Design goal:
Oligomer: homodimer
CATH topology of one domain in chain A: TIM Barrel
Radius of gyration of chain A: 24 Å
Shape of chain A: globular
Bound molecules: D-lysine
CATH class of one domain in chain A: Alpha Beta
Largest sheet of chain A: 9 strands, mixed
CATH architecture of one domain in chain A: Alpha-Beta Barrel
Protein name (chain B): Diaminopimelate decarboxylase
Largest interface: A-B, 105 and 99 residues
Distance between the termini of chain A: 59 Å
Cofactor (chain B): pyridoxal 5'-phosphate
GO molecular function, one term (chain B): diaminopimelate decarboxylase activity
Organism (chain B): Phaeodactylum tricornutum (strain CCAP 1055/1)
Keywords (chain B): Decarboxylase, Lyase, Pyridoxal phosphate, Signal
Chain lengths: 437, 429
């Protein structure tokens, strides 16, 4: 019952990556897994047109940007730095939209090159309008619809928890500022033209929740008759572990596309749709590849067997940050599929950082508790593969903690060959900006 | 009224760091606060000697290292990379202790230079013994005493921890026979299970840790590790080094009387040395509102989890103060406002004012009324912030670090990273 491969790495393909990266740890990305997600998103049900934007904050490697560009997938940038980064990878400016918490001081330069801006607060709209007064520049507007992920918590707001929308969220402009005239007054003051509305409150895999997401956001498109595009954001869930449900884009897409048809039947306007998936595009396409460098034991009550890797929260932080479980497969350090065998052992996986919280197998949703996974019996030198690590891992980790170098990145082509796309960082590069004093 | 200053920055001094750094965000370190912490640690009560090691994993800046080195403070490194990094800052090899989860493949090269190694596993002790078999080597042993912080959760000791060698492998001959099979000389013992502020607990920590130096008569040093608690927020208790050290020093006296050996003591403060000595200096670049049930006023900083992760990672509260953006203390005023503070990352969890221990729940702080452009200073951020953050998330460059001397002058110790450097190691095709 031992897995003969991981989500996309056989024992032969894993050693091929390690050789290309000069050792462990490393990030492995599979072109095959990127093509499945790209095609699945480009097949999203739409009524009058679809645009897929990659939320590059999930994984900003230029090869990933170049690949999604070749598939006619656009880019959703989270800051002026991501805008300038995507343009370095060859993405044209017009294919980038900027939705940020911090409007960069050089936003006007980006807008001039063709970058579409989604104003995310009153302050950003006014700064945009001050610079392009009476012209009247087109701009996007992100709205906080007044509700977030969960509805009204099946009762009243309840506890004020973090959310992508609602009264406990700082994202977007509060919906009451749209309906009380505050935002339309700013638009008229600077002669702006609102061409696009942006929302981001979708979650789960319920088609009837996504239809309500669309209906509510579309109601803001009738406030500004010049709007021609509706950006519904991301949030499509990916089930990394067995039993968890991945969102079916065809099942939730058709009620969304019908909500677009109902708008065109009640308003007479056929709107372009946009989606901003981050996790759904790159999550299962990436995997952390590390080696078991040590194996220790405790005895007595609450004792465990610990597998210590040469990686950790420096490379995958989601276990420590959320208590997220990742699929884990242990392959023979020989690289031969004949040495997989059929021996299992329940273990706890820990990271190489000298920190108690550097745990790789936590209890679901509780990063302070231990949990054991039944894996292949591992000797020192065997490869551990953490799958589903292509989103918010390389692009969001505590790199250089304990002064560990930033892990390299490898691309595995459709033929099973490994290509290095980011060389390992050197030690001196970690403190190359320090100044003597 | 409102605070006319932060823990160590006035509006004028804060503007000085911003000038020296080119803008916000930035880390600021106080030479004064480092000096105050260095003296308290160097005054730890001891019976027969004390060595203070800075756990550089909390802030590895070379100026911080050079400073502690000038104060006779040694280094506790947690990886082969930190050992070399500390050596690049001018720290001798002999002033470095290596206690790491991951033994580097070039560890023999570090040991020959003078670096002292504490084996944290049977595997490590065996790899050390195989390379130095019968050559008169000396080594330390890090022992899991069998109890963590309780004198199933993640702990620094006990059956739940992977640090380090399980005590039952020492008391059943296994570790003794490894040392004897390779001709090793166990030089010191290493534990790290102390916590809190109770001197009775610290005395139980020292006694149980000293019971393992009985197994190896060659032991001359006893490293009790770190974990000295720092209360960043007003009302929280900071460990009194003087009152917990008197019962610990008595344990060394009781060991010398009954066992006949006067052991040297070592401590590894990390948080205690640098936490209060550093602050995150940022700018309020936006301010938004909501209405209705559980509505809030939000301050959007130009920093976030990319710079200070402890709020999101632990739900840890940090002391916060707001200064006028003009930099003139005459502009502090008397106006206040309860606000939620959020970072600049497009992330629902980039909260900077969470509930204590619940990083997903919002909890407002009463601060000075903030206009866009004002300065927010987050104190208690010199430990596990610049040395432990999600930098380059949303491609934000690594923030600069500034040192503030005794005369109030700001000195740049790390320039702001450029966008190009964030992906200077990427290869095409
Ligand atoms: N804010 C991040 C939340 C991650 C949720 C996780 N279950 C996923 O599917 O990606």
């Amino acid at each position: 019952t031992n897995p003969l491969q991981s989500i996309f790495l056989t024992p032969e393909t894993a050693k091929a990556c390690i050789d290309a990266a000069g050792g462990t740890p490393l990030y492995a990305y599979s072109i095959d897994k990127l093509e499945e997600a790209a095609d699945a998103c480009l097949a999203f049900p739409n009524a009058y047109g679809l645009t897929v934007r990659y939320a590059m904050k999930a994984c900003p490697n230029a090869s990933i940007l170049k690949y999604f560009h070749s598939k006619n997938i656009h880019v959703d940038a989270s800051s002026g730095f991501e805008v300038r980064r995507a343009m370095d990878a060859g993405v044209p400016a017009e294919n980038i939209s900027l939705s940020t918490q911090e409007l960069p001081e050089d936003f006007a330069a980006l807008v001039d090159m063709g970058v579409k801006l989604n104003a995310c607060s009153v302050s950003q709209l006014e700064r945009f309008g001050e610079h392009y007064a009476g012209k009247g520049a087109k701009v996007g507007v992100r709205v906080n619809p007044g509700v977030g992920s969960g509805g009204f918590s099946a009762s009243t707001t309840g506890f004020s928890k973090t959310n992508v929308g609602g009264p406990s969220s700082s994202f977007g402009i509060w919906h009451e500022l749209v309906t009380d005239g505050t935002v339309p007054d700013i638009v008229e003051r600077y002669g702006l033209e609102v061409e696009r509305i942006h929302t981001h409150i979708g979650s789960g895999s319920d088609p009837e929740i996504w239809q309500q997401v669309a209906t509510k956001s579309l109601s803001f498109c009738k406030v500004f008759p010049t709007v021609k595009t509706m950006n519904l954001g991301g949030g499509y869930k990916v089930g990394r572990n067995k039993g968890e449900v991945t969102t079916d884009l065809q099942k939730i897409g058709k009620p969304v596309a019908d909500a677009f048809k109902k708008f065109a039947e009640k308003e007479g306007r056929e709107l372009q749709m946009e989606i901003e998936p981050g996790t759904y595009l790159v999550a299962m396409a990436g995997a952390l590849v590390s080696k078991v460098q040590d194996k220790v034991h405790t005895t007595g009550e609450n004792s465990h067997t610990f597998l210590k890797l040469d990686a950790g929260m420096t490379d995958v932080l989601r276990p420590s940050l959320y208590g997220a479980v990742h699929p884990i497969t242990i392959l023979p350090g020989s690289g031969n599929s004949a040495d997989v065998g059929d021996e299992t052992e329940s273990v706890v996986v820990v990271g190489h950082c000298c920190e108690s919280g550097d745990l790789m197998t936590p209890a679901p949703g509780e990063p302070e508790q231990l949990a054991e996974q039944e894996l292949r019996a591992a000797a020192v030198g065997d490869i551990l593969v953490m799958d589903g690590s292509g989103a918010y891992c390389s692009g969001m980790s505590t790199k250089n903690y304990n002064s560990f170098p930033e892990a390299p990145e490898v691309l595995v082509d459709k033929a099973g060959k490994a290509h290095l796309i980011r060389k390992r960082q050197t030690l001196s590069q970690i403190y190359e900006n320090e100044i003597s004093v």
